[PDB]
């Protein structure tokens, strides 16, 4: 399906460059909890909501990349001459992010030292999300509409990216300051967002089609919600609340 070798290699390069930028951020907090043997400063509510965001994106990537049954439903849907919009680096990212989120969740349990349980309202959201996904599973099952089910997981991942960014931007607006700002972590999130979009743009200009942006709408919105909020964070840090 890849027509151009330079475009394919630049797609593969931009792919692992997006993977590295978003996967390396998981380590500084992981190591900090380890050195301390405590999770006092951690928002437990956010770690449980990011597990749902990561596992839903992981469901979609692992299934579309490895299942030929689901892939055939993608061609039946977006077109026979369509390239699958899941990359090796997207699969690697989703699995690595699920592993790292499970490790920090394990650190919260074994290291404890976090009386601030936080756990409430956000627990109801996990119940509502996984409940709505369970109903969706039983709807999809008789017809084996695994592409529609995988597609719900990718849409709930989108909602969950908003859940990552919106409370932290809202906090900065009420607070009238950017507390916890790090030009480095924002630039790593930014690179991963631009590179995840440049990957789709390369797949789209290699083939003469934009259907990959519609097939993997969840990855398209994952990059655009990251880029929008990084511009907004940089905007409220330098021109709004600087000092």
């Amino acid at each position, epitope marked *: *399906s*890849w027509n*151009s*070798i330079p475009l*394919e290699i630049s797609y593969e390069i931009v792919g692992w460059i997006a993977f590295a930028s978003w996967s390396i951020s998981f380590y500084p907090q992981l190591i900090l909890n380890f050195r301390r043997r405590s999770v006092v400063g951690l928002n437990f509510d956010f770690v449980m909501l990011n597990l749902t965001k990561h596992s839903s994106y992981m469901i979609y990537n692992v299934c579309l990349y490895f299942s030929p049954v689901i892939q055939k439903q993608y061609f039946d849907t977006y077109g*026979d*001459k369509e390239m699958i919009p899941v990359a090796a680096n997207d699969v690697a990212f989703s699995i690595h992010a699920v592993v790292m989120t499970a490790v920090t969740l394990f650190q919260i349990f074994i290291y404890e030292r976090g009386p601030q349980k936080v756990s409430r309202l956000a627990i109801g959201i996990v119940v509502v999300v996984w409940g709505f996904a369970a109903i969706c599973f039983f709807i999809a099952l008789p017809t084996h509409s695994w592409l529609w089910l995988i597609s719900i997981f990718n849409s709930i991942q989108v909602f969950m990216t908003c859940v990552k960014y919106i409370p932290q931007a809202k906090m900065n607006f009420t607070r009238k300051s950017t507390v916890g700002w790090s030009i480095g972590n924002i630039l790593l999130d930014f690179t991963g967002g631009l590179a995840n979009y440049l990957q789709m743009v390369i797949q789209s200009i290699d*083939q003469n089609s934009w259907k990959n942006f519609y097939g993997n709408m969840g990855k398209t919105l994952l990059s655009l919600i990251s880029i929008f909020f990084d511009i907004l964070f940089m905007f409220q840090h330098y021109v709004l609340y600087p000092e």
Partner: nanobody
Amino acid sequence: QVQLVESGGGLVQAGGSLRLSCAASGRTITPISTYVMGWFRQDPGKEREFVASISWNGANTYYADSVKGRFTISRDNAKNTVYLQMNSLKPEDTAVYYCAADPESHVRLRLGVGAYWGRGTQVTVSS
């Protein structure tokens, strides 16, 4: 899953113009017309050397340095056939020519890491 049959020729002379063909068959989730195809030559003793490849859109044609500006590759997205038009041949071009096809990667195909390969058909260029 996919069978590749090289319907090529045999013996020609130094400075001749031979022409290989390659039909692709089999039932697959991908159209086979979108499948990236190419050629490789074996040669007594030496490992699989790349010869040429054509994109599924048939626009991008890659050629090895050795054959570049001598061989030409053409596709037929309808018959699923690749053609190696080996013009102005040299005695050093005598080898078994393998047809190759990859459902997804052009890079994999170019690097000898393709999924599918043909029987191979001997091309004898004699001085």
